[PDB]
Amino acid sequence: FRTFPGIPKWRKTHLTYRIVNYTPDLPKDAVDSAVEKALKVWEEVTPLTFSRLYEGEADIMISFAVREHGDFYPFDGPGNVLAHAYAPGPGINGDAHFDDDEQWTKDTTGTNLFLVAAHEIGHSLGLFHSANTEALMYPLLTRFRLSQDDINGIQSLYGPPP
Numbered sequence: 001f002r003t004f005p006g007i008p009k010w011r012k013t014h015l016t017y018r019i020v021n022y023t024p025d026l027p028k029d030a031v032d033s034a035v036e037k038a039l040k041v042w043e044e045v046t047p048l049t050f051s052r053l054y055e056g057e058a059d060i061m062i063s064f065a066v067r068e069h070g071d072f073y074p075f076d077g078p079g080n081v082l083a084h085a086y087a088p089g090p091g092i093n094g095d096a097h098f099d100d101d102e103q104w105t106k107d108t109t110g111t112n113l114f115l116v117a118a119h120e121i122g123h124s125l126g127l128f129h130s131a132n133t134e135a136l137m138y139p140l141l142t143r144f145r146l147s148q149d150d151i152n153g154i155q156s157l158y159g160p161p162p
């Protein structure tokens with residue numbers, strides 16, 4: 001596993017998230033479900049806990065965007081970059097943006113929202129890319145399981161569950 005330079009990590013255990021907008025590709029409940037599941041992946045193996053906001057600034061602001069979207073890193077159309085997320089910290093830090101030029105799906109027929117959200121939330125929590133090909137944090141459904149490498153890395157930052 002890898003962390004970010006200077007090892008930025010959240011200094012508190014309870015983090016908020018907010019789903020700022022919704023893709024046309026999926027029912028809203030499928031977006032909410034995929035996000036909740038993605039957060040749970042990491043909650044299960046650390047002392048981190050999460051709660052959702054519907055107004056104000058949550059630590060992890062989640063949104064869908066296309067091309068230029070209010071930051072220095074425009075998305076690139078279909079394929080290639082699927083989403084991006086910022087390392088822990090204030091403001092834009094922690095936030096996760098999903099390219100709506102992808103076709104987000106609940107299954108594997110398009111780009112699976114849950115898998116990509118789980119990987120991006122890893123970044124939001126302070127893990128950079130792993131060298132292990134089976135890790136969620138490697139740049140790349142019934143068989144999904146967080147790898148030990150991912151657990152080792154997230155626990156290196158936040159410890160194991162109490």
Ligand SMILES: [Ca+2]
Nearest residue numbers: 059091093094
């Ligand atoms: Ca933030």
Ligand SMILES: [Ca+2]
Nearest residue numbers: 077079081099
């Ligand atoms: Ca793209």
Ligand SMILES: [Ca+2]
Nearest residue numbers: 025100102103
């Ligand atoms: Ca789309």
Ligand SMILES: [Zn+2]
Nearest residue numbers: 071073084097
């Ligand atoms: Zn962005």
Ligand SMILES: [Zn+2]
Nearest residue numbers: 119123129139
């Ligand atoms: Zn990544």
